[PDB]
Structures are given as C-alpha cells and as structure tokens.
Design a protein around this ligand. Structure first.
Ligand code: 9O7
Ligand code: MG
Length: 748
DNA sequence: CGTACGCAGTTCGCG
DNA sequence: CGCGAACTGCG
C-alpha cells in the first residue's frame, strides 16, 4: 500500500520517496530517475535552438534547460505539438517558468505548477490506499493552560492524551490518581514521553481533531521554547506546517496525519462542530466538555484535576473512535481521486475533481489547460448563468403526495448529452446534441473527456447505496449514507467544476447547458404528469416535485406514480431516469425552498425550514417541531398555538436552559473584510481583540443578553455565559426566535 | 486553499 | 417603520 509521496534533494537532484506499507512492515522506496518538466508551445520549431539557451537565477546558482523533447499530445481532443522541457530540480521550474513563456516565439506553457510529488503519482500510475494492508492508528489530543490575552502557546501544555486499540492514556506533569494517567515530572519530559510513545507504537496514521490548526502548532512552539527535537516522522523529521489560504495544514513524513475536523465538515451538517457535538451526532452518546477556564482553576489550585484528566482522556478516545469510522470512507475516496489520504481529506470539490482529471488526462496524452491568472479568475467570478427551476408552491394543506426525483440528474445529463469542453461546438461531427435555451452544440461521435470519467463515479455511488439497504446495524448504515452523500456531491461537482472560476477545464457553456437541460427535463416531466396522468405538481425544485392526485387514495396515487415512472423513463434518453423518492400522507408548502411533510409512519420530513437552519436557537427548533406535529400529525391549529404560548411564557419567566438558546453562525472570511457587522461578527471581533484566534469557517456560538439596541451589542459567546452573572434577552428570543418561524407556518 | 445557482430569511443603518 | 444592502445557509 502507498501511504504518501514526497521528494528530497541529493547533490542537486530530486529523489522521490515513496512511503509504503507492505506485508505489515513500513518501507521507503526511492526513485532517483524522475525528472521534472513542463510543456511549451511555439510558433516555429526553429526557435527550439533559442529556448534551450534560456537561463534564470535560483539562489546564486544558474539554472539551465536540461533536455528537450518534441512530443505529440492532444489539447481538448485536438492534436497539438508541444515540446517537453526537462530540468534538473523541480524548484528550477518556478524560476524559469515565466521567462521561457516570455520568449517572443513561445505561445504558451502548460503543466508548470503540478507538484513534483503528485507528478510522480500521476505519471507512474500509482494509486494510494490500494491493497490488503491494515493500517495502524493512534489518536492524540492536548490540554493546554490558557489565560485571556496571552500569545499563542505562551502557557504550557498540561496534558497529552493518546488512544488506540489498547485503550487511552494521559501524560501530565502533576499527580493525578487515575489508573489511566501516567505521572511525569515536567512538561518537557511529558512531551518527550509522548514522542517516545508515538515512536514505540509507530502508527501509520495519526488522528487529531483540528490538529492542523492548534495541536501541532501548540506542540511546535512549546518544543522551540523547551529545546525538544519533536521528531514525529518516520525519517526523524519534525511535523511540517503548511499554509493553505487562511487555514494551516500539518504533515508528518512516513505517516498520515488524519485530522478529523475537515472530514466531518464535508461529511456532516451540524449547528456546532465541537468534538462533543460531533461525537454525539455520530454515536448517539454525550461527551462532557471542560472549558479553558475550569482547567486553569483546576491546575493553579490543584483540585478538580481528576475531572480534567477524564476530559483530555475522552478527547483522545473520542477522536480515535471517530477516526476509526471515517478513515475507510476517505481511503476509498483517496483511491477514486488518485491522491494520498493526507491531501484528499483536506480538499474540497474543486481539487477532488481536478486531481482525478489530471491523472486521467495523462493517461490519454491529453495536455491539461492551465489554471487562470488573477485576471481571468476575476472574469469568471462575475460570470454566471441560469440555474435550476423552482416553482412557486401551491399553498394550503394537501393529501397523499408522492415525491419523484431524478437519479443523478446533472451527471446523467453530462454523460447522456456528452457535455465537455473537448466536445462543445466541435467541428466536423455527424451527430450533435443541442442544449435548449443556450443553444450550445455537443459532438457525440466519441465519448468526451469528462463524460467518459463521470460514468464510473455514479457506479461507485450506486454500489454503496446498494450496500446501505443490505446493512442492518444502525451505525454502519449511517456511515454508508455519509459515504454515498460524499460521492453524490462529488459527482455533481463535475457540473460545478464547469463554472468553477479556478478550474483548468473551465467550460461555462457546459454549465449553462447542464442546467438548461435540467430545466427542460423537469418542466417537461411536470407537464406530462399533469395532463396525461391527472397529477397536480404542488412544488418543484430543479430535479424533483411533489404531486398528488385529487380525491385519490394512497394506493392508487402510488400505483399511478410508478406507472408514470415507466412511461417517462421510456421516453427519456440515455441515463435520465425518474425515481420514486417516497409517499407523504399530508404535506405543507409555505414558500420556495421551505416545506413540511408527514409520511405513512407519522415521521416529519422538512426542507430548508428553521428546524434545519443553523442560525436558529434550539428553543426555536424545538417549538417549531411541536407546531409541526400538531398540524400534520394531530391536525389541530389551536393546540399548535397553545404550545407557542407555553414556550413564550416560559421564556418570559426565565425557565428555559441557556443551552437551548444558543444561536450559531459561521464566519466566512477574515474579520477585517466584513462590511456589515452582525451579531456573530460582533462576537468574532471581540475574540480576536483579546487573543482568541478566528479563522474563516469558525462557528460563532452566542447568546443574546437583556438590553436594548443592536442584538450584537448584547451578544456574548456561550462559553463566556454564566447564569449567575448574565441574564438572557427574554423578549428577543421570543419576538425574534420563536414567533417568526411559527407565525410564517401559521399563515395557512 | 477556493464546485455551481436559486432564494427565503435576519441584522443593520437610515431617511 | 421598512426598503436596501450585507450576510448566511439550505436544497
Ligand atoms: N452541491 C451541489 N453542487 C452542484 N450541483 C448539485 C449539488 N447538489 C445537487 N446538485 C444537482 O442539482 C440537482 C440534483 O440535486 P440532488 O442532489 O437532489 O439529486 P442527485 O441528482 O444528486 O442524485 P439522487 O437524486 O440523490 O439519486 C443534482 O444533480
Ligand atoms: Mg436528484
């Protein structure tokens, strides 16, 4: 099995290192024959004598063109003649890249920014996470002493806990009488003992939770001050910290640092992403949280340290139990995309698409287009197109509604119609597929680049979905849904990649066509089911609709639904297939993207309502459900109002716990870039003002205290809330949190 | 580093 | 006030 891939320099030459695990033994394979390169297109081949002479300057020593090779490739399915410009060191490319392209006889250059380590995996056709090996895992967390206003890692690390298959332990430099706590003299020896523990166990994977932005950065600065060689890598190297825009990423050579934070973000939608909330959402078990203020009081006074030891212990145990479940999903994801687990688990949709396309483009001798410069990126940013069709819903209560949705509509349209930049308006074809509204033509004489790839991705999604119904244990089935939902978003991401401003294969006309076909296929199917089968589409969004048959019983509307499915599926071309997504007893439709339905088993399904939105407190989500049950299950509006008065009167009497009054909202940029300061911004700013780091993606959890004026003026972080000192705003959480979401529903 | 558009809903400043 | 803008998140 291939774990990762990097390169070192030996006498000026790059040496690709392949970290592998075969037959249960970690090994390092060396390749000193790979040479960096990038392509260049010229006007006349006579200029090749002048391009070889082009030199640049890299830290004193000169850099020259090592070797050249005229090769025959294809640029978007069309023949192209480029020259392979070879170089000694990979870092020689960024020094001479702009100057070779600057030659008057050079049209453009290509493939000059692919990292040399990833270039080795693509060119040699290596796929990581392949094989029968069972990796060894070990999670770890740290408990650090904090005081308001102190610099990062100014206070010392108090405890270092680790966990794996043999249990969990904590290392601290103060006496704690618990059987799983190893007592130690000083903090430096505590860090040293943990370093020896990782070395003795030699885990291939290191599980952390936000270790990319805290744990490894804290252990680093502490090791600098204490003079410790924190050699965690299998080559005796210290963990490297990398910058990724606004967040940091930490790599460990020879192993795989599996930070659980970015994985859970792209996998589960939660109002808060604390380790305690994530552990509860996945396993159904509650985790106690000890705050940075109590741990200080426990350390300076000495009493209560046993409680803090359990917190750090559980922090490592919870992280190992969480990492043991989500690694198999990312391992297969690393297999499909073709990049290491370390890079894939931290990447969004844009690179998960482009990396797989880069690997497949090399297989087909397809010269990859370049990422746009700053200007072309800004031009594609403002560029947009029409999206999906949303019908203004039919208001009122309705009976016996069925939900019909298209199966992978956007990927089906891409493959059925061969939507691809190497296909868009290709000259000389005998068969075309014209898109409605936009009018873009697409050749069909041969499978396009992207459509030939998107086929296998849908099969993988249907492979996990088929395993979901066959699995009975509630935990595995929950993880398989996360898996399929991860592949489903990845598949539709190939459409968004067409309109992605930083995409190499950016094809806006491809993106306009996909949504244009999507709008035509949903509006035609809606009309067909209304005039030909007697259905009545009450609401529709992009690729699905809810429609009953007036006066018909349940069994007939379900039988006629599957009947219409065979009719429209026999009329749809290619992979377009309408699916039966479920039957609903009674259903509500307030407005666009907001509805509430009940099923035959009395379960309440909602869409886009405040019950799901994060920026609504729990007392709002709790009350809305009670009004939703009385209306859809009990069918009685008067009790629904009676529930509201009881909750509203409860907030007035200061009777609801402050845990059910926390409003969460995510920071989406640097705090200085904000133009309008809301409540969650006013709290985020007051955290960076006193030392608390705030990066984009941070979820601000605040509570609104009693006062007058701006809501953000009296909003404080919930961790700062003490019920003896702060009294929450009874009127705000009434008039602004509970009534509006229910009053909008009670309009019916 | 950073998939797409559509659109309901809230906070805030202000005339 | 309540529109207009900024802002978020869901589907
Ligand atoms: N995050 C997204 N980014 C881009 N396009 C998307 C996204 N989500 C959905 N689409 C596309 O927008 C329309 C459609 O959304 P469904 O997710 O509701 O349906 P499937 O088609 O995914 O597959 P199933 O029905 O789950 O078997 C999808 O094609
Ligand atoms: Mg669908």
């Amino acid at each position: 099995m291939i774990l990762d891939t990097d390169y070192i320099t030996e006498d000026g030459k790059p040496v690709i290192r392949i970290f592998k695990k075969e037959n249960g033994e970690f090994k390092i394979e060396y390749d000193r024959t790979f040479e960096p390169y990038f392509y260049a297109l010229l006007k006349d081949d006579s200029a090749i004598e002048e391009v070889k002479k082009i030199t640049a300057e890299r830290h004193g020593t000169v850099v020259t063109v090592k070797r050249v090779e005229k090769v025959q490739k294809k640029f978007l399915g069309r023949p192209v003649e480029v020259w392979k410009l070879y170089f000694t060191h990979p870092q020689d490319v960024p020094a001479i890249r702009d100057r070779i392209r600057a030659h008057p006889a050079v049209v453009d250059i290509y493939e000059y920014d692919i990292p040399f380590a990833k270039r080795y995996l693509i060119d040699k056709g290596l796929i990581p996470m392949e094989g029968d090996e069972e990796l060894t895992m070990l999670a770890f967390a740290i408990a650090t002493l904090y005081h308001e206003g102190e610099e990062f890692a100014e206070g010392p690390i108090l405890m270092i806990s680790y966990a794996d298959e043999e249990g969990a332990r904590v290392i601290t430099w103060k006496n704690v009488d618990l059987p799983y706590v190893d007592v130690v003299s000083t903090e430096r020896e505590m860090i040293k003992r943990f370093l020896r523990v990782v070395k003795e166990k030699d885990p291939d994977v290191l599980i952390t939770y936000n270790g990319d932005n805290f744990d490894f950065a804290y252990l680093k600065k502490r090791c600098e001050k204490l003079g410790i060689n924190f050699a965690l890598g299998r080559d005796g190297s210290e963990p490297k910290i990398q910058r990724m825009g606004d967040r940091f990423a930490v790599e460990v050579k020879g192993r795989i640092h599996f930070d659980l934070y970015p994985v859970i973000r792209r996998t589960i939608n939660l109002p808060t992403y604390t380790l305690e909330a994530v552990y509860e959402a996945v396993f159904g078990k509650p985790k106690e949280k000890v705050y940075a203020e109590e741990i200080a009081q426990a350390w300076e006074t000495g009493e209560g340290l046993e409680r803090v030891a359990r917190y750090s212990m559980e922090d490592a145990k919870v992280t190992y139990e969480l990492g043991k479940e989500f690694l198999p999903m990312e391992a297969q994801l690393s297999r499909l995309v073709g990049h290491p687990l370390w890079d894939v688990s931290r990447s969004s949709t844009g690179n998960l698409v482009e990396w797989y396309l880069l690997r497949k483009a090399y297989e087909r001798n397809e010269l990859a287009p370049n990422k746009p410069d700053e200007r072309e990126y800004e031009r594609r940013l403002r560029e947009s197109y029409a999206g999906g069709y949303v019908k203004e819903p039919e208001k009122g209560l309705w009976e016996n509604i069925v939900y019909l949705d298209f199966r992978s509509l956007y990927p089906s349209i891409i493959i059925t119609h061969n939507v691809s930049p190497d296909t868009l308006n290709r000259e000389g074809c005998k068969e075309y597929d014209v898109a409605p509204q936009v009018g873009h033509r697409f050749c069909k004489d041969f499978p396009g680049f992207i459509p030939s790839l998107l086929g296998d991705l849908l099969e993988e999604r249907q492979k996990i979905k088929r395993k979901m119904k066959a699995t009975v244990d509630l935990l595995e089935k929950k993880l398989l849904d996360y898996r399929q939902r991860r592949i489903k978003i990845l598949a539709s991401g190939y459409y968004g990649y067409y309109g992605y401003a930083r995409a190499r294969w950016y094809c806006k006309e491809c993106a306009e066509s996909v949504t244009a076909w999507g709008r035509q296929y949903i509006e035609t199917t809606i009309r067909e089911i209304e005039e030909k089968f007697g259905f009545k589409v009450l609401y529709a969004d992009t690729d699905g609709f809810f429609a009953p048959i007036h006066g018909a019983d349940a069994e007939t509307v379900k039988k006629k639904a599957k009947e219409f499915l065979d009719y429209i599926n026999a009329k749809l071309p290619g992979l377009l297939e309408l699916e039966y997504e479920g039957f609903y007893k009674r259903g509500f439709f307030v407005t666009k993207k907001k509805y509430a339905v009940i099923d035959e088993e009395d379960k309440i399904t909602t869409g886009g309502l405040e019950i799901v939105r994060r920026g609504w407190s729990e007392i709002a989500k709790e009350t809305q459900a009670r009004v939703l049950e009385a209306l859809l299950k009990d069918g009685d509006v008067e009790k629904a109002v009676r529930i509201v008065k009881e909750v509203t009167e409860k907030l007035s009497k200061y009777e609801v716990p402050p845990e059910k009054l926390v409003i969460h909202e995510q920071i989406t940029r640097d705090l200085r870039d904000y133009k309008a300061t809301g409540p969650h911004v006013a709290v985020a700013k007051r955290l960076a003002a006193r030392g608390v780091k705030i990066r984009p993606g941070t979820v601000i959890s605040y509570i609104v205290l009693k006062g007058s004026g701006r809501i953000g003026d009296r909003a404080i972080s919930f961790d700062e809330f003490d019920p003896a000192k702060h009294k929450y705003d009874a009127e705000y959480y009434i008039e602004n949190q509970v009534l509006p979401p229910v009053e909008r529903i009670l309009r019916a």
